[PDB]
Design a protein around this ligand. Structure first.
Ligand code: 8RZ
Length: 228
């Protein structure tokens, strides 16, 4: 996250770190007792390595009582996703057992009503992604509050030039922004999961190039089918 602040520890008990060989790779969101939602392309370069999900964390490195690193039984990228597109950019990870729940580990309710938010709606995005142009990596979870940017503006030739389908949404990116390593993490509005940070490399913090997030409501049937 560019331009953000250190999150209150454990105040987002849904927040997950998706890891490859014990290193943070992507954000994710606990959406059911045994399932974490993330971004499709998070595991693009993984097959030779161990995929795990860290729940209950604030610091990536320090011991905390609620921190637990779960193994993954199965990874389910969206079957329509393709490398080098932004569409269908969702991933479901089934943990090796149900997560132990408590004040610091809890699933987030997620949006099933497929309608847009009001422009300007203030949403929260959190992550352990880079925090500056030099690529500095935070030990602890960061966050930013971002207004939603209307799709028409987001689609103009100067911005994302027609690439924002009805299945995607945008948030402003003026200095405050998601960036590398925040892929897969949650965009939360009104205490409900609305979006998932996209995987595609994209420039960070340029107001002219808004953040892109996959709308979870647009994929409710897929999520339900996999979860079941
Ligand atoms: N939406 C948004 O703005 N963005 C999303 C990006 N996608 C990623 O980030 N990755 C894609 C999903 C894979 C793995 C993952 C990754 O590289 N993860 C990664 C790799 C190396 C280290 C790392 O840790 C840390 F801390 F640096 F983030 C994460 C991204 C990259 C550059 C610019 C913008 C970016």
């Amino acid at each position: 996250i560019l331009g953000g602040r250190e999150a209150e520890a454990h105040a987002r008990p849904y927040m997950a770190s998706v890891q490859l060989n014990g290193a943070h790779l992507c954000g994710g969101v606990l959406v059911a007792e045994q399932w974490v939602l993330s971004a499709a392309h998070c595991l693009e370069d993984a097959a030779d390595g161990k995929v795990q999900v860290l729940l209950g964390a604030h610091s990536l490195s320090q011991p905390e009582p609620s921190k637990r690193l779960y193994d993954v039984l199965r990874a389910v990228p969206h079957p329509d996703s393709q490398p080098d597109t932004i569409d269908h950019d969702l991933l479901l990870l089934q943990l090796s057992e149900k997560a132990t729940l408590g004040p610091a580990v809890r699933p987030l309710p997620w949006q099933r009503v497929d309608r847009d938010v009001a422009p300007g709606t203030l949403c929260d995005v959190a992550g352990w992604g880079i925090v500056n142009h030099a690529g500095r990596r935070p030990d602890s979870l960061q966050h930013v509050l971002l207004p939603v940017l209307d799709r028409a503006t987001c689609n103009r030739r100067t911005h994302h030039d027609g690439a924002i389908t009805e299945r995607l949404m945008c948030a402003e990116s003026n200095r405050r922004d998601s960036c590398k390593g925040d892929s897969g993490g949650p965009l939360v509005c009104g205490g409900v999961l609305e979006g998932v940070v996209t995987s595609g490399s994209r420039v960070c913090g340029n107001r002219k190039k808004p953040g892109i997030y996959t709308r979870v409501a647009s994929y409710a049937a897929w999520i339900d089918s996999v979860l079941a």
